[PDB]
UniProtKB/Swiss-Prot annotation:
Family indicated by similarity: Belongs to the krueppel C2H2-type zinc-finger protein family.
Organism: Homo sapiens
Protein name per the record: Zinc finger and BTB domain-containing protein 43
Cellular localisation: Nucleus
Domain of life: Eukaryota
Length: 110
């Protein structure tokens, strides 16, 4: 074994994403197509009728007392609310550059 080389095998999807397996990429392709006019943008469900969806949406319904500051996202749970916001800011701070002047970079003479 002197040496070896290789890349990475994956499976592209209609949307553009790439999965490790074909079955994982396929399921994402069939879902893309239009199945029902009503779709639950909370869990990932769907219903033919509008009333058929409501009887299910009642499982997600609920006021969001906790909301982010950067993305202003809404979260019903506390642990998740803070758990997310905590990071959501981490990055924001980096950009804040409250007192971080962007000084040009050093060139290269070769
Ligand atoms: Zn896809
Ligand atoms: Zn749902
Ligand atoms: Zn956020």
């Amino acid at each position: 074994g002197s040496s070896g080389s290789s890349g990475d095998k994956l499976y592209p999807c209609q949307c553009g994403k790439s999965f490790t397996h074909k079955s994982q990429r396929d399921r994402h392709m069939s879902m893309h197509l239009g199945l029902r006019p009503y779709g639950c943008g909370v869990c990932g469900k769907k219903f033919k009728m509008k009333h058929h969806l409501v009887g299910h949406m009642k499982i997600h319904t609920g006021i969001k007392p906790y909301e982010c500051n950067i993305c202003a996202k809404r979260f019903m749970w506390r642990d998740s609310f803070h758990r997310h916001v905590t990071s959501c800011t981490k990055s924001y701070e980096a950009a804040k550059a409250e007192q971080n002047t962007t000084e040009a970079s050093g060139p290269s003479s070769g």
